[PDB]
Design a protein around this ligand. Structure first.
Ligand code: HEC
Ligand code: HEC
Ligand code: HEC
Ligand code: HEC
Ligand SMILES: [Ca+2]
Ligand SMILES: [Ca+2]
Ligand code: NA
Ligand code: NA
Ligand code: NA
Ligand code: NA
Lengths: 376, 125, 357, 375, 125, 354
């Protein structure tokens, strides 16, 4: 029953009674592990923003990181560092713009690199996790640029330098598969494979077109880099799965997250990070609710869980709150994270039973993005 | 009040999120921080870029294209926030996508988001 | 009303309005080509040849289609010059424009108002037609006759024949047809990209008779058309100052600005711009990517394979509108071409099929 | 009809008429006696906002962004506004830059941006009289606490920081002339500080005007044009000092609360607890019943008293948790009542106390109201 | 909780605004952003300056001086905000004054406010 | 036996037979009438003390023995820092290890060796009885046992309530017996909130049971050489007092110039101040700290001389993190700190305050 605050008070009281001396200092966070979860608050487009580092097992904030305008957070899967690409202005929201990448030590949270990006080249957009992406070796960060045209910036994290912009076709998002290769999703309904050396034009190859013009693939797909599994819902809860693990795209059988009867009774996915994927269980989790067709970014109160191989529904959870984003820890007996932008609260659930275990409130102004590391 | 219910436009109050021109607005209504329905507030810079939506006017029964141009160069106003998404498509159809900061073209290279205006720019069709 | 327009119809195709009787308005403004000049001269189709058969103009002959929708020259409520006729707005309105080609030695070359009045007096149907509308002896007074002819021609240009509003675009807007998916994408790009800042009548709201121009004056930084400049004989030193050439405009900030042309029938009225520098529609669209694209190809004119060239007038460019921060990929260029082609009047759709080929 | 309704009707009429209007950047209406500014220190956030409000219509007519705990000022004559502000190179970390911006009050564009060398501002929850303009509008003075009380001199007309002035152990800045201001000292005197373009300033103290056991609040009211400094204590005794001559003349203390009210737990409380109307010569004080050490909590009442006699004129039940008050300085004033918790400015008739209108969604923790005395 | 009622300390929860050592805290409790009762969160800088208050400990009947030292160099945490003012005096008695940002002495010249710790520094006289 | 050992110490403490020419005892330099410090004027005033040969001067100021029994043996604390020991440089581990050093130091009591000391002990029949009751037959015939035993006795005596009575005004106030004046109270508050607390309080947080206003750590506060004392000591114009780095076993150059934080108990009556007695007046020692924080030009001047303080004797390893607090003490707070420090005077030395 005892809360963190109570346990802390008891410990402070025992130390005082014992005459224990202790030097006030700066704390280090505990070692990154599978139950650490990061929550980013884009703060409804505010000029400065915050990320909260959370122990999901305790439901406790263990650290924070400040950011600028609409930063893109990334987390190395092996737990060795975290980074973001951010944007500041010389007079709050006016004046000279500077875009930069910071890399941070995951335990001290100090910055270990601050790499300027020339000519203010980031895409300023409500936050999509796969618009800035680490390669599997953690040595390169790739960020998306929209203006003047779609392009991808290559940032060397090891030598702590921007390298160059790559020209790409009319495509979006970045799913890295190798030190020198990533995929994007193109307007024409194909994926593009982009393979880049140290200099010169990248080699670009398209897949088959895998969805028609009027099937809408959401801005927040789930991507497991370790599995090479890209899980891409549409507005109706149809789920495309692409296996990129061979280095080339293989299209898996499509699954429906909702049944025909649910679709006829107004059920549709809705929210921000609407989909999660657990790699070891090979399971998909989708935020859904009954909604008009053009209310696709509103919160949802339910999560369906399905087997990714068969499309078989495994569970349907009533979340008990207005949930915008979900994700999962990637360990055995995972947690299911359910973040409410309106409540500014992360609800932590058992992913098996659906039950709310604990919660962490006061997460900024408009928190939206949950990131975890797959350390397994 | 039900966030998931079909959105229902009105033509009687431009500061409310159900005003008919606001059918795919994302951010804050400029009329609430000293702009107007189609003008930016003092000190901010009017983008030339936009996302568009076709919004039905219940007054005259016409659907008009609304070009959502941002006013940029100030921190977000924090007044009259709204997010509607009628006809709104994902980012790979960017002319209809509303998470993007549509501040391109604004004077002084301004790119931070303060609020959005809702001018009609043409007939839908 | 009707009778005035019917007199102008006759005058419009009457070669007796040129000194040596070889040309009429319709020679350069051919109704089979959206009222533009199909005739090949020394600079191809970039500029037109006058009644003496040698003299070339220094500007491209524009369509007369929809010219009747252009307001008279004025300063608008935003402080901007607006409306008028010719590429530099030097004529106030159609009536003031009409007698100019008639007296221009590089065009129809009539020596004076008196010589035109003599020709009108020769045709028995003109004496009857004009006196019925203007009073007895109208044709015996050279300034009366000359004003009356210009008024007739202006009325003829304001009829439905010149502005029919029957393009695919118009049919789509009333629900008779739908855009193809490419044309629809082109309409959406045109409306949301910087093109809408200059090539729509209104800054906001809707026009009942949209002609895809705000009638303002802008310097989009075009190079000299070298073969046209040569042909026109104006010299290696010449600078076409555009709107600054209008009498009573003196501000150097107007140098090099030209009237935004209506995009109706644009797919069939090549070559393009005030000096016909670009032969193909797609090239005219790609020109705008010089201000936005970072790719080296954006600097190259695809018709020459060489850089575009320096602007004839390197100042006063409309950079706030042109430097939009967004480049048109090839898929959006294709979509813009498809959209602009829907702005072709019905009777020019077979012509369009020829230009497409 | 509400503003948004009236605007919807106008837009509908322009659409039906085919009226074209160019989308553009608006200018705010001319500064007038009923304009009011509300600064939001946002509970010590690294960036902050100011709201420019037409108090007559209850309408936001503009905003101005600021950095960490900026100090706003407004020229009484309406000719400009300004603030001293602080930014950092990486949000809240890295190289600090302190600066003054002056803004045109119609376009809101900055007309000066004046760097203050060596990050000299005092970072404190916002007190209006910690940064102050001289009455000619040519000089801005700001307080420094570290390493010691000092006052910085910023020339607005030549757009340049001038120098720091050493002062005694004293606090706040109440300018009285182009070259002179007063401060409140720990020893309980005021210090008069007269400064040249160089040389130590000339400093002279008044007599001690309060003992060590009376606590004078951080937010006195000061009317520069009346020269009146109105200074409440935690118990609602009010010191008044007349600086109109150029030198301090002490006036009798008045009690804002009766002896029976004091016995029953009434004390001022809030942030800007006191306002002063120049032409009516009246004081307004936020009061409630509260424990003696709950002095920064909101109050639900305002007392109004005649500054010459101490006589109570009104007691208003405000109907909301109010943290700060101020008044317009025109003949029939508005009484402004800002609630930090509601993020709302309530606008009252100062004579009757009745709430006329309100302006909500004023940032995160709005605290400071400023008006111009254009009279 | 009546905000104007006399403040009542407890010794059972350090994250609540009535914890006995928070008797003159202004800002945010560091324990709620990854510090502890007497340590700063990761990535912040511990000031050496403080304002002080005598706070009564109901567990042992003693009054202690608490030194409210700030953790600096980060934007304000926004978690567990509290403002108490037991014994708090105005700015001209700064040792007892708690609107001041008590960041002096912090490493890297950090002067932005993140949160405040509540260590006991001596017995109250 | 606890009492017996300390009573033997009481005797040794005042016995000039422990000095070569028998002109001095521990009480000569550590005079009980002056909070166990040296009232005698030498060539450098009261800055340094004169030994038994009537000529040799030390190079450091004689510190009080009051409260020195509360100092832990030299060690490294939980935070990684050196702490405790005796002498300004911590070179003795504890009081027992310290005691025999003045006895044998040729600039102090000047006994030639431990055998010389044992012989003085044997020459006196009261010692023979007292030593053997405590340590065993023959303890005084064995120079190294005798000398160890003498040192233990002296250490035990220094641990008696007499050297550490805890009866200052500060103590009476903390026991609830009386109140501080407003000035003394403000002084205590200033002491606690300003950087003095970082070094001059036993604990980092919490309360000490027996507070002696020092954390027993080692700090270089950047003091200049006391020229007249350095002259008097005869150590030379090139000599550097390296403080803690002189302790055998310490080799790290980062310890050069660091000295043990002194207890501030009885500070008002034990001038002149610092390890070399450079400042005569308590107020000057407080004002010295303003050199690191104040922007006023007076802060660079030593008010005793009207001249700049002088360069640090060791201009490396200064405790700048602590010293550069960003806040200047005005004259009001200096007055308050003097009033507070005076309340740390033991009751028996209150008459010395004027
Ligand atoms: C020899 C070729 C030629 C003939 C004959 C000719 N035009 Fe033109 N027309 C031009 C050219 C070239 C321009 C553009 C000239 C300029 O901008 O300075 C022009 C421009 C115009 C315009 C202005 C349209 C606009 O958008 O600015 C009108 C109206 C017009 N002509 C009507 C007439 C009428 C009526 C006649 C018969 C009296 C006529 N034209 C005879 C070549 C000719
Ligand atoms: C700043 C105003 C402006 C913008 C923005 C603009 N144009 Fe133009 N456009 C002009 C002007 C003025 C001309 C005539 C220029 C000249 O000939 O000197 C013109 C000429 C044209 C022509 C040739 C028409 C003819 O009859 O010769 C085409 C096609 C055209 N524009 C298409 C577009 C498209 C498509 C876009 C958006 C990609 C666009 N323009 C953006 C002002 C603009
Ligand atoms: C000639 C003067 C003189 C005599 C005699 C003398 N002392 Fe000292 N004492 C000093 C000086 C000077 C210091 C500081 C020396 C140093 O730090 O190197 C000192 C330091 C000490 C210290 C360390 C205290 C501290 O705070 O570090 C102790 C304990 C001490 N003396 C005890 C004794 C005892 C016991 C005797 C008699 C056996 C004695 N003293 C005799 C002058 C003297
Ligand atoms: C960084 C640690 C540190 C801080 C902070 C500090 N002191 Fe000290 N203090 C010392 C050390 C070490 C000495 C002995 C220095 C030496 O003599 O080499 C000393 C000596 C003194 C003495 C002389 C005592 C004697 O017996 O000679 C006084 C008085 C004193 N300090 C008062 C203060 C006051 C008051 C403050 C706050 C303004 C303060 N100190 C801040 C470490 C500190
Ligand atoms: Ca043409
Ligand atoms: Ca001494
Ligand atoms: Na040519
Ligand atoms: Na002219
Ligand atoms: Na000396
Ligand atoms: Na050593």
């Amino acid at each position: 029953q005892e809360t963190q605050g109570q346990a802390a008070a008891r410990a402070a009281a025992a130390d005082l009674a014992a005459g224990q001396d202790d030097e006030p200092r700066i704390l280090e966070a505990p070692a990154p592990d599978a139950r650490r979860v990061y929550v980013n608050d884009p703060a409804h487009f505010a000029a400065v923003t915050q990320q909260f580092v959370i122990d999901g097992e305790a439901g406790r904030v263990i650290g924070m990181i400040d950011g600028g305008f609409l930063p893109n957070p990334v987390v190395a899967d092996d737990g060795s560092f975290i980074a973001h690409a951010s944007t500041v202005f010389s007079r709050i929201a006016r004046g000279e713009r500077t875009d930069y990448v910071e890399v941070f030590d995951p335990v001290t949270l100090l910055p270990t690199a601050d790499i300027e990006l020339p000519d203010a080249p980031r895409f300023l957009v409500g936050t999509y996790p796969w618009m800035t992406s680490l390669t599997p070796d953690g040595k390169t960060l790739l960020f998306y640029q929209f203006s003047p045209a779609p392009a991808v910036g290559v940032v060397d994290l090891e030598g702590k330098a921007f390298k160059r912009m790559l020209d790409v076709p009319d495509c979006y998002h970045i799913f890295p598969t190798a030190p020198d290769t990533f995929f994007m999703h193109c307007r024409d309904g194909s994926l593009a494979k982009v393979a880049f050396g140290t200099e010169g034009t990248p080699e670009i190859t398209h897949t088959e077109v895998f969805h028609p013009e009027d099937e809408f693939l959401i801005n927040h797909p789930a991507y497991s880099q370790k599995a090479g599994r890209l899980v891409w819902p549409t507005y109706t809860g149809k789920i495309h799965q692409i296996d990129l693990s061979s280095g080339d795209a293989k299209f898996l059988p499509a699954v429906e997250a909702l049944t025909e009867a649910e679709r006829a009774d107004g059920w549709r996915p809705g929210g921000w990070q609407q989909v999660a994927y657990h790699r070891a269980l090979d399971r998909i989790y989708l935020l859904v609710d009954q909604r008009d067709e053009w209310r696709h970014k509103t919160a949802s109160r339910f999560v369906v869980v399905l087997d990714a191989k068969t499309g078989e529904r495994l569970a349907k959870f009533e979340m008990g709150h207005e949930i915008d984003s979900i994700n999962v820890s990637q360990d055995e007996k995972p947690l299911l994270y359910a973040l409410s932008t309106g409540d500014k609260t992360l609800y932590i659930h058992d992913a098996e039973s659906g039950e709310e275990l604990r919660s962490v409130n006061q997460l900024g102004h408009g928190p939206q993005v949950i990131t975890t590391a797959d350390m397994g | 009040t039900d966030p998931r219910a079909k959105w229902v436009p009105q033509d009687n109050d431009i500061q409310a999120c159900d005003y008919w021109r606001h059918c795919s607005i994302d951010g804050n209504i400029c009329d609430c921080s000293g702009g107007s329905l189609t003008n930016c507030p003092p000190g901010t810079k009017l983008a030339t870029a936009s996302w568009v939506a076709s919004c039905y006017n219940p007054t005259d029964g016409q659907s008009y294209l609304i070009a959502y141009r941002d006013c940029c160069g100030y921190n977000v106003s924090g007044r009259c926030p709204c997010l509607n998404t009628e006809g709104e498509l994902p980012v790979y159809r960017p002319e209809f996508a509303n998470d993007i900061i549509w501040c391109f073209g604004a004077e002084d290279d301004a790119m931070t988001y303060h609020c959005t205006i809702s001018p009609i720019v043409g007939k839908a069709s | 009303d009707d009778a005035l327009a019917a007199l102008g119809a006759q005058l419009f195709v009457d070669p007796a309005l040129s000194r040596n009787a070889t040309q009429s308005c319709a020679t350069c403004h051919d109704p089979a080509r959206a009222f533009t000049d199909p005739r090949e001269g020394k600079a191809g189709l970039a500029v037109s040849v006058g009644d003496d058969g040698q003299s070339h103009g220094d500007r491209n002959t524009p369509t007369l289609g929809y010219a009747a929708l252009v307001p008279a020259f004025h300063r608008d409520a935003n402080g901007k010059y607006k409306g008028g006729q010719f590429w530099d707005g030097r004529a106030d309105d159609l009536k003031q424009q009409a007698g100019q080609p008639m007296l221009n030695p590089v065009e129809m070359a009539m020596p004076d108002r008196a010589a035109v009045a003599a020709r009108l007096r020769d045709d028995p149907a003109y004496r009857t037609g004009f006196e019925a509308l203007f009073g007895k002896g109208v044709l015996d007074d050279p300034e009366r006759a000359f004003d009356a002819a210009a008024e007739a021609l202006a009325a003829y240009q304001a009829t439905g024949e010149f502005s029919p509003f029957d393009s695919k675009y118009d049919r789509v807007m009333r629900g008779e047809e739908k855009f193809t998916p490419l044309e629809e994408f082109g309409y959406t790009v045109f409306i949301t990209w910087n093109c809408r800042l200059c090539h729509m009548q209104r800054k906001q709201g809707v026009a009942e008779r949209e002609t895809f121009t705000n009638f303002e004056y802008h310097n989009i930084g075009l190079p000299v058309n070298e073969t046209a400049r040569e042909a026109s004989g104006l010299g290696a030193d010449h600078v076409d100052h555009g709107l600054l050439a209008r009498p009573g405009i003196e501000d150097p900030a107007q140098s090099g600005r030209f009237k935004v042309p209506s995009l109706r029938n644009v797919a069939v009225t090549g070559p393009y711009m005030h000096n016909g520098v670009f032969t193909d529609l797609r090239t005219a669209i790609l020109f705008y990517n010089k201000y936005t694209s970072r790719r080296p190809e954006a600097k190259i004119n695809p018709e020459t394979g060489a850089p575009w060239g320096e602007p004839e007038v390197a100042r006063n460019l409309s950079l706030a509108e042109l430097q939009s921060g967004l480049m048109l990929d090839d898929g959006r260029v294709d979509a813009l071409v498809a959209f602009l082609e829907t702005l072709t009047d019905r009777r020019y759709e077979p012509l369009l099929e020829e230009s497409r080929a």
